[PDB]
Design a protein around this ligand. Structure first.
Ligand SMILES: O=C1CC[C@@H](c2cc3ccccc3[nH]2)N1
Length: 168
């Protein structure tokens, strides 16, 4: 059983932790909790092969900018979870791209783009904008949801799929 280091960062109010809880114990929390650092290790069967997802739900804030590089180096899988309502989180991906590139020492790395709370009527971030930017970075886009659960399981599957192509 191979373990995969997954670092989850982004903006605040996106519902990063909510997504993980939906996969870990299949539970949805309406109330928001200030997650500083949470370790979620669940064995998931990706494309027939069971892998151990070592997901680290951390806070991508300025107060953790000096510690971010610590886990980003060992991190293999990166879930770029942004919000469709909060267009600012969509622009925050630029800063992350620059940092991750510096921490990984590589421009081409295995990463996935996922938009949470896609079931919200307030869609500020347009699908074309997200899709276009996804191609620029070279990462796939998946519309996720913690309340409605829209292919959340497959979102994690595809993450490993991209990572596998970086090896084999
Ligand atoms: O001994 C430690 C301190 C950091 C923590 C950790 C790093 C990390 C990176 C990617 C994914 C999960 C991760 N968990 N383990």
């Amino acid at each position: 059983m191979t373990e995969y280091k997954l670092v989850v960062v982004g903006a605040v109010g996106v519902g990063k932790s909510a997504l993980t809880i939906q996969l870990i114990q299949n539970h949805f929390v309406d109330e928001y909790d200030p997650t500083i650092e949470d370790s979620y290790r669940k064995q998931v069967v990706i494309d027939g092969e069971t892998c151990l997802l070592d997901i680290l739900d951390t806070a991508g804030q300025e107060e953790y900018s000096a510690m971010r590089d610590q886990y980003m180096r060992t991190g293999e899988g990166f879930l770029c979870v942004f919000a469709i309502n909060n267009t600012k989180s969509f622009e925050d991906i630029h800063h992350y791209r620059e940092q991750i590139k510096r921490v990984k020492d590589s421009e081409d790395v295995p990463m996935v783009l996922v938009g949470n709370k896609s079931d919200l009527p307030s869609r500020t971030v347009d699908t074309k904008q997200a899709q276009d930017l996804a191609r620029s970075y070279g990462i796939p886009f998946i519309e996720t949801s913690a309340k409605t659960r829209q292919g959340v399981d497959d979102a994690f599957y595809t993450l490993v799929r991209e990572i596998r192509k970086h090896k084999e």
